[PDB]
Amino acid sequence: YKGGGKFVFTQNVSSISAFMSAQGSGFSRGSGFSVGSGKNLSVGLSQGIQIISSAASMSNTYVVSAGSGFSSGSGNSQFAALKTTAANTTDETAGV
Amino acid sequence: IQIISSAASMSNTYVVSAGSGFSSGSGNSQFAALKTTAANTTDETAGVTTLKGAMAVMDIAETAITNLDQIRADIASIQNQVTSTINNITVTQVNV
Amino acid sequence: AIADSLRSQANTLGQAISNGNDALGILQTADKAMDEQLKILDTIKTKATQAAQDGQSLKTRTMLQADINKLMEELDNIANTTSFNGKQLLSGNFTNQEFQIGASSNQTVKATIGATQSSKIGVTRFETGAQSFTSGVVGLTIKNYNGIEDFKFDNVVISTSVGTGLGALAEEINKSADKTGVRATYDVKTTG
Amino acid sequence: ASKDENGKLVLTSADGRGIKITGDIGVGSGILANQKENYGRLSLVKNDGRDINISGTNLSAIGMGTTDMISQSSVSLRESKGQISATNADAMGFNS
Amino acid sequence: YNGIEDFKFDNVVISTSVGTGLGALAEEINKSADKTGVRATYDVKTTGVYAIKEGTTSQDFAINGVTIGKIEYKDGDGNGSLISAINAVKDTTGVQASKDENGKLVLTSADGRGIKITGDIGVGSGILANQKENYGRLSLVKND
Amino acid sequence: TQAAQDGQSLKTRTMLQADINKLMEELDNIANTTSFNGKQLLSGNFTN
Amino acid sequence: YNGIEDFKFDNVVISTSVGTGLGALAEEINKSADKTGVRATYDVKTTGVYAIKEGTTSQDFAINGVTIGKIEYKDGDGNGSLISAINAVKDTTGVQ
Amino acid sequence: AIADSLRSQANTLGQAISNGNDALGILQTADKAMDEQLKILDTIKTKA
């Protein structure tokens, strides 16, 4: 799943709080797992979710800045590397 | 004698508080557990030490046998597949 | 060039044979281990049957339960113990394990030996309805009995006659036991 | 008809026909006016651990209608090895 | 593909059936391996996050088109009932439920058929509503 | 043939089917695996 | 645990139930031994001091939730009554 | 082509024998169990 760290969406939510408040997710006010309900799934989401706000501009998840060879609209925009602070991509044990 | 005043609102006999997943009008409202202070429900002796306990442990053991057979069948299927692969590889290596 | 390609393929297949033999060893070990768990579970069920009679007091049923405790301890001990060289086979951490058995890169078999611990094997599902005070012709339906369709029983009478009642319903349900996996019993008492 | 240990009155039905007393039994025997129409209760047992999704046509007669408090649960071997909880026991089939 | 012209594979269905999926595509790609130099494989898993909690599935929880039903699972899935009930139909669906080391819920498909769960699996298992429709990944490997 | 009898419940038939799945997987593996020096022989692209 | 990242286990209950305690923790740890290299065991005892004298337990003396009652024991427990009375529920409590 | 056709027909019949020897167990069990019901009805008619 696209680097072994957090999971990466492309939704249009400002933060995990509104992503839970929003429809579709199982965290709606009617459901049992609302924010502040003893389940404490907000921490679980914070550890394993990285929501890209707008796919048009994502410099906080991929190394896609101007100096990089992958600037949006400059070709190669779909090959940019993930960001180690955004995700939790760690190296693998050496070789075989 | 424990008289419930009205079936629409009975939070003094079953555990139907808002925190529980058995709130009325939210589904599951007919599976709520009794209240130990309201009724006088006490635990039972441990396991096969009672008659109905024994006749329940019988089914639990039957289901356990079922599950172990189901797992052993998977092991056996993998083993037969590996054996066939090994025969085919043994012939192909000679031909190569 | 062709000779070197064929030599590489012959060596890779010669190593794939050893990989297959190792996989066979692991799987045989796991199976011959699970055999004893099967026998232990049989013994447990036999003891529960022996205790399910009412010619035995609580003091002897307690010896039955003490024996079952040790037997189940042994079962989970076998589960958490059987291991090849550290790889615990019968515990639940042997999921999605490959064994390269091909000349090229990603040809392999896969092993996902399930978990066989006493906290996870035997999980039955009980239900029980409130004490019924009303009569009437009843027709059940166990929805999704096999993953595709429903399962409608026959209409059954209840009230007080010989061929009526919860006993009749229990007969009708236990009849089709092998298809639904749902056995039924009853308990009819009016205690003050 | 039988006499309990604590002195209560017990009217059991072997083949499950349902007890119905018509006349006045006489209070003081222990049987309230609400127990005169009795048909016992059903006890299903699956062997996989998923909810039996019973939905018939006339269900208030077996005591599993849309207004009947039913109990359901699933137990493992290790869970049976200990003390049977009060709700788990009612699901098992103790305490009619 | 060879310095002069292109190379068009034949169309390949995807969704959830036996002759579909990334495995059905990898077969086709690997078949014409000696002419393109491009060998392919696949990896079709669906791994939750926030390893696991206590919850229940909807009455009509179904996976790959076959209905399972309501399952109540404990905090760390001590019952193993969820894994057992998902695995009891593994050779009809194509998915094999498993419990990861960290406690997460792993749903893998051996022959690459694509996992598609319809009902509410129940948040608490860790499978977000953005994963209920998974068909895995592709992995090509050239050698030049 | 072994599962074509009615002394076997759906569970045992399911064990049969689960085994047949792995056997057929092996068949496909042989087909897509046998190759001389990249030339896949038993796949269908060894024509003419 | 290996040179790059950490290793998070599962949340394990402790208190007094069958599927709880340092036994459950040791199971959960020893399961993941091949990757971490950290096996585990346990030792759950409760040894008195000033070896033993004459005295009695309170009328509500209980252990792990099961009530035992009053027990009059001699100086060196010459009766063995204390040990026998505590052992009479060894397979319900888990305490020998 | 023939030997592989006979090798299957020999394997099948070899398995079909097991289906018969299992269809005998199911039938003998059902038969010897009816034996007691006949001795019961005999008693009822005698008691009547």
PDB file of N, CA, C and O in Angstrom, chain E residues 51 53 75-76 99-104, chain G residues 6-11 13 28 32 35:
ATOM      1  N   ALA E  51      -4.315  -0.945  14.549  1.00  0.00           N
ATOM      2  CA  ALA E  51      -4.410  -2.366  14.247  1.00  0.00           C
ATOM      3  C   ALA E  51      -5.794  -2.987  14.378  1.00  0.00           C
ATOM      4  O   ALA E  51      -6.307  -3.523  13.392  1.00  0.00           O
ATOM      5  N   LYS E  53      -9.774  -2.932  16.914  1.00  0.00           N
ATOM      6  CA  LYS E  53     -10.562  -2.585  18.088  1.00  0.00           C
ATOM      7  C   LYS E  53     -11.752  -3.523  18.190  1.00  0.00           C
ATOM      8  O   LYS E  53     -11.849  -4.490  17.431  1.00  0.00           O
ATOM      9  N   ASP E  75     -11.783  -6.688  21.421  1.00  0.00           N
ATOM     10  CA  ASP E  75     -10.810  -5.615  21.249  1.00  0.00           C
ATOM     11  C   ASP E  75      -9.671  -6.018  20.330  1.00  0.00           C
ATOM     12  O   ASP E  75      -9.521  -5.462  19.238  1.00  0.00           O
ATOM     13  N   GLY E  76      -8.873  -6.989  20.751  1.00  0.00           N
ATOM     14  CA  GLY E  76      -7.740  -7.402  19.956  1.00  0.00           C
ATOM     15  C   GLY E  76      -8.089  -8.562  19.054  1.00  0.00           C
ATOM     16  O   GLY E  76      -7.202  -9.242  18.531  1.00  0.00           O
ATOM     17  N   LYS E  99      -4.244 -12.199  10.596  1.00  0.00           N
ATOM     18  CA  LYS E  99      -3.955 -11.196  11.609  1.00  0.00           C
ATOM     19  C   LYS E  99      -2.465 -10.895  11.579  1.00  0.00           C
ATOM     20  O   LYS E  99      -1.642 -11.784  11.816  1.00  0.00           O
ATOM     21  N   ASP E 100      -2.123  -9.647  11.284  1.00  0.00           N
ATOM     22  CA  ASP E 100      -0.731  -9.248  11.202  1.00  0.00           C
ATOM     23  C   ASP E 100      -0.089  -9.284  12.587  1.00  0.00           C
ATOM     24  O   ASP E 100      -0.762  -9.418  13.611  1.00  0.00           O
ATOM     25  N   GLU E 101       1.239  -9.169  12.608  1.00  0.00           N
ATOM     26  CA  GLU E 101       1.969  -9.189  13.871  1.00  0.00           C
ATOM     27  C   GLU E 101       1.536  -8.042  14.772  1.00  0.00           C
ATOM     28  O   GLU E 101       1.179  -8.249  15.935  1.00  0.00           O
ATOM     29  N   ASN E 102       1.555  -6.821  14.243  1.00  0.00           N
ATOM     30  CA  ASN E 102       1.147  -5.645  14.998  1.00  0.00           C
ATOM     31  C   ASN E 102      -0.324  -5.659  15.378  1.00  0.00           C
ATOM     32  O   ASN E 102      -0.775  -4.724  16.044  1.00  0.00           O
ATOM     33  N   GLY E 103      -1.082  -6.673  14.974  1.00  0.00           N
ATOM     34  CA  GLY E 103      -2.489  -6.757  15.284  1.00  0.00           C
ATOM     35  C   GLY E 103      -3.412  -6.299  14.181  1.00  0.00           C
ATOM     36  O   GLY E 103      -4.629  -6.458  14.313  1.00  0.00           O
ATOM     37  N   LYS E 104      -2.879  -5.730  13.106  1.00  0.00           N
ATOM     38  CA  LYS E 104      -3.716  -5.236  12.031  1.00  0.00           C
ATOM     39  C   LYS E 104      -4.417  -6.392  11.328  1.00  0.00           C
ATOM     40  O   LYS E 104      -4.001  -7.549  11.406  1.00  0.00           O
TER      41      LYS E 104
ATOM     42  N   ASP G   6      10.618   0.513  15.121  1.00  0.00           N
ATOM     43  CA  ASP G   6      10.203  -0.020  16.407  1.00  0.00           C
ATOM     44  C   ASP G   6       9.352  -1.268  16.193  1.00  0.00           C
ATOM     45  O   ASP G   6       9.173  -1.737  15.069  1.00  0.00           O
ATOM     46  N   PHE G   7       8.794  -1.810  17.271  1.00  0.00           N
ATOM     47  CA  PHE G   7       7.931  -2.984  17.190  1.00  0.00           C
ATOM     48  C   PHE G   7       6.819  -2.836  18.216  1.00  0.00           C
ATOM     49  O   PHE G   7       7.046  -3.034  19.411  1.00  0.00           O
ATOM     50  N   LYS G   8       5.619  -2.511  17.754  1.00  0.00           N
ATOM     51  CA  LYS G   8       4.468  -2.333  18.627  1.00  0.00           C
ATOM     52  C   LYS G   8       3.721  -3.648  18.761  1.00  0.00           C
ATOM     53  O   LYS G   8       3.408  -4.296  17.758  1.00  0.00           O
ATOM     54  N   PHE G   9       3.442  -4.041  19.997  1.00  0.00           N
ATOM     55  CA  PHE G   9       2.656  -5.232  20.261  1.00  0.00           C
ATOM     56  C   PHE G   9       1.175  -4.878  20.289  1.00  0.00           C
ATOM     57  O   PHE G   9       0.760  -3.784  19.907  1.00  0.00           O
ATOM     58  N   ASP G  10       0.362  -5.822  20.745  1.00  0.00           N
ATOM     59  CA  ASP G  10      -1.058  -5.574  20.906  1.00  0.00           C
ATOM     60  C   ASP G  10      -1.358  -5.175  22.342  1.00  0.00           C
ATOM     61  O   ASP G  10      -0.634  -5.533  23.272  1.00  0.00           O
ATOM     62  N   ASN G  11      -2.435  -4.421  22.519  1.00  0.00           N
ATOM     63  CA  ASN G  11      -2.882  -4.097  23.864  1.00  0.00           C
ATOM     64  C   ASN G  11      -3.414  -5.353  24.536  1.00  0.00           C
ATOM     65  O   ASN G  11      -4.304  -6.021  24.003  1.00  0.00           O
ATOM     66  N   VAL G  13      -4.925  -7.190  28.111  1.00  0.00           N
ATOM     67  CA  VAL G  13      -5.583  -6.979  29.392  1.00  0.00           C
ATOM     68  C   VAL G  13      -4.772  -7.715  30.446  1.00  0.00           C
ATOM     69  O   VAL G  13      -3.921  -8.543  30.112  1.00  0.00           O
ATOM     70  N   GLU G  28       1.621 -13.446  23.973  1.00  0.00           N
ATOM     71  CA  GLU G  28       1.677 -12.456  22.906  1.00  0.00           C
ATOM     72  C   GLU G  28       3.112 -12.094  22.560  1.00  0.00           C
ATOM     73  O   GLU G  28       3.425 -11.810  21.400  1.00  0.00           O
ATOM     74  N   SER G  32       5.797 -13.528  18.698  1.00  0.00           N
ATOM     75  CA  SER G  32       6.681 -12.785  17.803  1.00  0.00           C
ATOM     76  C   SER G  32       8.135 -12.871  18.249  1.00  0.00           C
ATOM     77  O   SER G  32       8.814 -11.863  18.409  1.00  0.00           O
ATOM     78  N   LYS G  35      11.207 -12.574  15.077  1.00  0.00           N
ATOM     79  CA  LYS G  35      11.584 -11.273  14.545  1.00  0.00           C
ATOM     80  C   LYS G  35      12.241 -10.372  15.578  1.00  0.00           C
ATOM     81  O   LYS G  35      13.147  -9.610  15.230  1.00  0.00           O
TER      82      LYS G  35
END
